[PDB]
Amino acid sequence: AKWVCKICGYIYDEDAGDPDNGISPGTKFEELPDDWVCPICGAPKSEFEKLED
């Protein structure tokens, strides 16, 4: 599953994960932290659109 920031235009890839902020390659969107926000703009995951999946 790929996600996107519908603010800044950043992207999450549940493949590539996010070890940068303590995500492993194969973590899910809503299987992220509560306090997981945008690594860029600081928009919480509430502000992250999907790429349809």
Provide the minimum distance between the beta carbon of 34 and Zn ion in the complex, in angstroms, as a whole number.
17
Residue 46 annotated as binding site: no
**Phi-psi sector, 13: left (phi>0), alpha (psi -120 to 50), beta:** beta
Q: How far is residue 10's CA from residue 1's CA, in Å, rounded to a whole number?
A: 15
Provide the minimum distance between the beta carbon of 39 and Zn ion in the complex, in angstroms, as a whole number.
8
Residue 38 annotated as binding site: yes
Residue 16 annotated as binding site: no
Contact 43, 37 (CB under 8 A): yes
Residues in contact with Zn ion by CB under 5 A are: 5, 7-8, 10, 38, 40-41, 43
Which residue numbers belong to the known binding site?
A: 5, 8, 38, 41
